Design a protein around this ligand. Structure first.
Ligand SMILES: CP(=O)(O)N[C@@H]1[C@@H](O)[C@H](O)[C@@H](CO)O[C@H]1O
Ligand SMILES: CP(=O)(O)N[C@@H]1[C@@H](O)[C@H](O)[C@@H](CO)O[C@H]1O
Ligand SMILES: CP(=O)(O)N[C@@H]1[C@@H](O)[C@H](O)[C@@H](CO)O[C@H]1O
Ligand SMILES: [Zn+2]
Ligand SMILES: [Zn+2]
Ligand SMILES: [Zn+2]
Lengths: 265, 267, 267
């Protein structure tokens, strides 16, 4: 048929796959933002969450773990800390217009990589039938937190497998349908974004909603984290020549499997 | 070697002279090879053309299919049991087209391939029995590869080809009369973004695509609408790299380079 | 910091003023370090020159060896139990040439290092006991690193260095009187393809190779014909990077950059 690989690829994307990065969140009514820990959705995409909320989109958190391990305060146990972080998360998400939060309650530092966790995410996908799903990019270089890696892998896997009636089939038996339905997966916390949201306007709000997680951001930690977080927003922004941005990686569904030229988007 | 001037000269001496490495004709003396696939259809999809060419050269090509394909349908009235039974039929006939001897079915459930000592011992049992001169398997470093059965197959293949050579590894194999693996001239990895050896499959493409469609349960008309162009686009990606129309890609490296090597990108 | 104009300015200030990240003399002040190796011989192969230099300045080098090297022989008359007892002695001898000191043996089996909270807890206990100023471990992101003990040592060492600081993590340690890991100034990854700090080991190269060859079970004469050139070439790859003949490379980054950082390649 076509002459060159470049023609083949271009036709693949453009016409066969209909890939469009100008407004990929344009028709979404319901989205899941999957975070490994309480606070990750806000650090990694809180500005974008605000913009979706404001636009009439329903934003639903699925938080994989409970934040149990995240303090050096020897007077605060993991149980007490987890209770405090659910409150932190609830308030921080109100500020961003966040509706609802599914807490999976795996212990922080202990998120399994297993069929079980896939079934939990699958149950939620089948219940809520979102149009889109956000999750950390499991390929981020030097990402040393297993909760992060595992979340990203489990999300992408679950978005696929929830579509298969023979996978976690008990779901169907109790009246759920397979996942439809979703228009997309977008990965945040990524080195290779190919879609950037300007949040220059929302950066102060984002910084405030982050700070609401006070257990995680006492004064002396913020002396480092605020510069760090502005510098990351500047990394993403510069890619589209704005001051503060949030970066997403989006790809056709086909590309997450056996594709040797994924770097061409 | 202690006298060699520069790193660049050392690397070329190491690669060519000490390791005797070159990609002129990697499949040269092979009488027998294993093709390790995660799911029924991966062998034909990643390397069907090469399989036919090896068959044509009188190489015994043997499949190892890690999983049963149980999950791969959206048809709500087809159980995974029934689908597995189907996909085995489909693979047997697909393989027949490519002159394929024999298939080992490991029978792990699709989406549930373990990454464990147990599965390496299964692969080792086969490598010690068959004593193949080469083993093909997916590159588990494929960027954005998001199927755990694919990544796990590839890492398990590579580890097994090494560990199956150690007599204290799965030692009961030896206690029942199997020898440690050797024979093995090579490992080659398909479904790869960094191929260094390309096989021209130009006038095999139509046979390759036919052998893929024999997996009907996977490739109905509406799926084929997208997948035929996709499969053509991939083969052109590889084919272009050596200036032919359609190709299949493999990454092949000295044995040493699968461990502590900081310059694997030079090949 | 609200006012800076460019990403490039923000990043320079972040690194130099906020994090005071310095790659000029990263081991300057260290009095005690841990070198974490998947198998016996990996400290010396990966960083023996460096270990000797640290020992020369009076730094106390402590090994933590994750496995017992049980599987690493092709000799059918040597069992894994006998091999592991030999390798323990070979490592004591190798380490004594480099000025080490003390070895912690985790004793997991070679090819079966778990990736789990348990192994994190073993490392966390050493860290809390020893309170080292610096920790060395393989780079688990090395391209094509196909030995699972290696990827898992690297991941677990980085995880443990962070989690051993958290009092709710493996809390029984503190209940027996250990404090959280307090002391470290640094993590350094060896066996790396993206080193950003190189120790010149030109003078030490021959000591390194001698202390490697003391692991005789691993390096008989026919293996050493391939391994000596491999090792020299690897050292020259690192060396060239600072204009010397032979070097050892490390990747060293600010602690923040091991998490959620999209610009790790700017160091
Ligand atoms: C920005 P984050 O991913 O939420 N920070 C996490 C925190 O949630 C977690 O409790 C802790 C212990 O695992 O590791 C920290 O690095
Ligand atoms: C080209 P393939 O790798 O074999 N197609 C697989 C199919 O085999 C499998 O049953 C399904 C569920 O795991 O995932 C699909 O992604
Ligand atoms: C240089 P090394 O990392 O120490 N060599 C290891 C050796 O220690 C181990 O016993 C064997 C079996 O796992 O695999 C070899 O690849
Ligand atoms: Zn997190
Ligand atoms: Zn497959
Ligand atoms: Zn090792």
């Amino acid at each position: 048929d076509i002459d060159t690989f470049e023609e083949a690829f271009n036709k693949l994307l453009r016409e066969v796959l209909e890939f469009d990065l100008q407004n990929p969140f344009k028709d979404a009514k319901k989205v899941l933002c999957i975070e490994p820990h309480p606070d990750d959705c806000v650090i990694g995409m809180g500005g974008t969450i605000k913009k979706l909320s404001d636009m009439g989109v329903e934003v639903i958190y699925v938080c994989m773990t409970d934040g149990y391990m995240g303090t050096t305060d020897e007077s605060l146990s993991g149980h007490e800390l987890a209770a405090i972080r659910r409150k932190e998360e609830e308030e921080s998400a109100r500020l961003l217009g966040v509706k609802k939060i599914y807490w999976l309650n795996y212990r922080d530092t202990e998120l399994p990589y297993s069929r079980e966790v896939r079934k939990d995410l699958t149950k939620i996908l089948r219940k809520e039938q979102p149009d889109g799903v956000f999750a950390p990019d499991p390929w981020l270089p030097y990402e040393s937190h297993p909760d992060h890696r595992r979340t990203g892998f489990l999300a992408i896997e679950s978005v696929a497998f929830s579509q298969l009636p023979n996978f976690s089939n008990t779901d169907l038996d109790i009246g759920l349908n397979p996942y439809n339905s979703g228009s997309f997966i977008a990965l945040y916390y990524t080195h290779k974004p190919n879609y950037i949201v300007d949040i220059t306007d929302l950066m102060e709000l984002k910084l405030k909603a982050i700070r609401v997680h006070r257990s995680q951001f006492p004064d002396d930690i913020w002396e480092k984290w605020e510069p760090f977080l502005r510098t990351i927003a500047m990394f993403y922004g510069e890619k589209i020549g704005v001051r503060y941005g949030e970066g997403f990686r989006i790809m056709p569904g086909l590309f997450y499997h056996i594709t040797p030229f994924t770097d061409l988007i």
